[PDB]
Amino acid sequence: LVPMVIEQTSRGERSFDIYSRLLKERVIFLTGQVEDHMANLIVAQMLFLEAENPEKDIYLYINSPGGVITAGMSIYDTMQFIKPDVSTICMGQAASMGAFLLTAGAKGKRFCLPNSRVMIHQPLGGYQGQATDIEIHAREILKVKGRMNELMALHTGQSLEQIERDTERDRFLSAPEAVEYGLVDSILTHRN
Amino acid sequence: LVPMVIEQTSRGERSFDIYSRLLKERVIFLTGQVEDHMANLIVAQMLFLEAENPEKDIYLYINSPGGVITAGMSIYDTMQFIKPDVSTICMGQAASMGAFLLTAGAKGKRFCLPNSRVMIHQPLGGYQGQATDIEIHAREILKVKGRMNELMALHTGQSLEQIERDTERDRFLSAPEAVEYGLVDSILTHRN
Amino acid sequence: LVPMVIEQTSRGERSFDIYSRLLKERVIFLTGQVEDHMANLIVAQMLFLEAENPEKDIYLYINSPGGVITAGMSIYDTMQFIKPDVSTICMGQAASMGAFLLTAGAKGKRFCLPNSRVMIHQPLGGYQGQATDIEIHAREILKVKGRMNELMALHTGQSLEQIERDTERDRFLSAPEAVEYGLVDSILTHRN
Amino acid sequence: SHRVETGSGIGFGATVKAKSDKASEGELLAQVEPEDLIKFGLIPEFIGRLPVVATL
Amino acid sequence: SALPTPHEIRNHLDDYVIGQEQAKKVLAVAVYNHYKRLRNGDTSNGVELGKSNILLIGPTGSGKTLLAETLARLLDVPFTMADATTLTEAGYVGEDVENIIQKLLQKSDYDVQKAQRGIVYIDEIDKISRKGEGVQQALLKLIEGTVAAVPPQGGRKHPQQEFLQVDTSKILFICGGAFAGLDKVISHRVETGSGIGFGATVKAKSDKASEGELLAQVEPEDLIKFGLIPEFIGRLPVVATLNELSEEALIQILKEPKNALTKQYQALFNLEGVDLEFRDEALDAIAKKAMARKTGARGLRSIVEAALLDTMYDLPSMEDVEKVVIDESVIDGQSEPLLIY
Ligand SMILES: Nc1ncnc2c1ncn2[C@@H]1O[C@H](COP(=O)(O)OP(=O)(O)O)[C@@H](O)[C@H]1O
């Protein structure tokens, strides 16, 4: 199913996977719903690349409809913790968590294709149980909402008040509009 | 089961899968429904092929019943971004995304088989929730339709109004009719 | 479980799969219901075989109960496009799609086993929705029906009227009867 | 041919399938270059001593 | 006979070689030293001056062999060459490394003094690397001094009954080769390690300078990644990189060199009494043809010869013709050089 490729060098020939071959070039793919299993794999890729060369940038291609917050924040904290700068490129779609991980890239290295859509909204949740338990979970998700908005305003450069109103409901943004909000820095249309 | 093939080279004999072997010849297969996982695989192949020779054409065989617009646009943007021209060949069926990706190839390199069927229609979708949310999603999909029609008119050459009326409902086109509409440039009947 | 076979040559011993080993001998297997994934696999094999020797004949074994019309046409167009002649051999059963690809082989190189069964009928389909949409699909399938009959008459050598009357309903033809109809040329009984 | 072969090896009409099919013979030999002789197995000094070549 | 100073060696080398300014200086002092020592056995002390080998890492048809050949011609000493791919370890059918010593002596005309002051030129050093290693182990010793038995065959079957032994610690081993891929290895160490992606740098802008500037930053570690054993690199202290011949270079090469192709044809036509001219427009087009087919500098002769073949077949059988002006259309084959008498 997954095609295989070969890398010809003076040493010889080595059979590599299409995704593994790109990993050598410091390229990570964030595809599908965000979860603990896929997020852990992405974290491992970042740490491995850091060991090879802590001075070379890492490219993260984001195309996902969103997912779990905890799994996503693990990647965010891992991108800011590692010394190398992480460049984010939006391909096709970037939802609530995907957009948060898009604007979280290094300044001047956040790109987006022209025919791309970006969506941002407040986190979702729920809990069934006793009233006192609902208050605990209800109060906790509110902190995440404010905590996430504070980070979006920091990376995007907007104000917390503007982010709160915009993230109240689903807000779709195109590539040119994302640049204005600060979610990305440039649009890639053609090579050179 | 995917058959294996042997490639004789200077170093000796190398084993490849039927799909991987054709990838070495700059041939990419777009089969089945278009989704995020499948689209990212095609993107990785395009980027990979660009590195060996940015001046050699890339062949994309399209046979699919359609798919999500977001994933398709990722492939469309990648095709236009990479320097080498992408030749699109239609075999079997080509739906909304298949036809859009079929006409997005390099001018003069869009081929189609004589008994191939091409279908084009407007985007599909939906949303369940509050009226305020429905309005947001309703306007979002409407912009996508206009953005898609604008691109379709550019490659085909037809006027925007004609593309709009013709895409109000499912429109089936054969290989000769596709040439008249501008979705393809030639028909491949026999070798040479 | 597919067994592994050994090929002895003056290059080194190589273990091959039973299906992959026969691919080297210009033999392609067409088994099960015809669909897009298997159709694209057969197409890839044909393009690979003509690269090794575009003059030698390609053998296609057909044992299938039919399948999608679009998937079959992909194989048909590929067969009539490649320079080498495609020899079709019917073992077991050959339904509507299997029979079309059977009679589509090179003239004088279509074979059938003595106890093989052949069946031909008009295409199937269906659509649920608005009346306007039904008329669009109703006319589309009718065009395919006429297109398939025209191609069937060309290879079988019969008249278009006879094909329409005979394909109105299921028609079972044994190996000796298929020779008279024109779907095949000869019958293979023993290795002479 | 390999030196003057451009395009893929496997594919539809776009691809060149002439590899085996004999179309012209003198044409390829006429465009012979010393570089080709290297691949054939002739040391560069020897092919460099013979500047002229006459295709028959 | 005072040795030629480095400047003199460079100024002259320019005449027959256009470009490669850095490599010219490297190969100027390296030879000025390799001979300044040989002519002074002692060192007014107990020191024993060593040898410094040269590693010519350049692209194909760049002037690697030419530089080694033209440098030996400036002086009067023997010149030999070889091919690493035509050697194998001991015990195997493959030609032994000692054979190279034989060829060296033959060119020396059965002499030791000359052979001791010879400049062998191994080539195609690449492609015999790891996964090869055995062939690189034998050469590793010859390059840093070894006495070798020279089979006594040749001039009077080499009368010397001691197999005419020769010390291989005074022969300048100019081991060259076109390390295809080193440019990428170096790029992953001196710039972004991403070759594939939307933010990478694909080499499609006809940047012929890229290979030259990249190779200039070569380091021993880069060669290790290429496969070359650490020991072999150590034996070759001097390294000189060559740039890639561009369109301007070829144009200059067709006119500037003392032995330029243009001058050659001009000389023979002058013997017949007819003059020959080469319009600058024609020259640049010829260069573009070479890059198109990637024939290189070696293919220039073929192009010009083909365009002058018919002309040569008619000049001796004609009269009153005293001048020819090759035009841009003559080379492509759509025109015939006008005879203005
Ligand atoms: N700078 C140059 N000046 C003149 N001739 C050159 C130059 N570079 C290459 N050549 C031509 O190329 C040929 C030698 O190629 P060479 O450099 O030996 O290739 P390689 O480096 O692969 O051995 C000679 O015939 C020579 O005329």
Q: Could you characterize what this model shows?
A:
This is part of a larger assembly, with three copies of chain A (192 residues) and two copies of chain D. Chain A is α/β, with parallel strands linked by helices. Chain A has a single domain, classed as 2-enoyl-CoA Hydratase, Chain A, domain 1, CATH 3.90.226.10. Chain A has seven helices and nine strands, in the order ββαβαβαβαββααβαβ. In chain A, strands 3, 4, 5, 6, 7, 8 and 9 form a seven-stranded mixed sheet that branches. In chain A, strands 1-2 form a two-stranded antiparallel ribbon. Chain A is globular and about 65 Å long. Chain D has helices spanning 26-30, 34-40, 44-49. By secondary structure, chain D is mainly α. The radius of gyration of chain D is 14 Å and the shape is elongated. The longest helix of chain D has 7 residues, at 34-40. Chain A binds chain B through residues 1-6, 12-13, 18-19, 21-22, 29, 31-32, 61, 63-65, 91-93, 113-117, 169-172, 174, 188-191, and chain B through 2, 11, 14, 16-17, 19-20, 23-24, 36-37, 39-41, 43-45, 47-48, 70-74, 76-78, 80-83, 132-133, 136-137, 140, 143-144, 147, 151. Adenosine-5'-diphosphate (ADP) binds at residues 17-19, 58, 60-66, 123, 178, 245, 253, 257, 297-298 of chain E. The PDB classes it as chaperone. The entry lists the keywords full-engaged state, AAA protease. Cryo-EM Structure of a Proteolytic ClpXP AAA+ Machine Poised to Unfold a Branched-Degron DHFR-ssrA Substrate Bound with MTX. Chains A, B, C: ATP-dependent Clp protease proteolytic subunit.
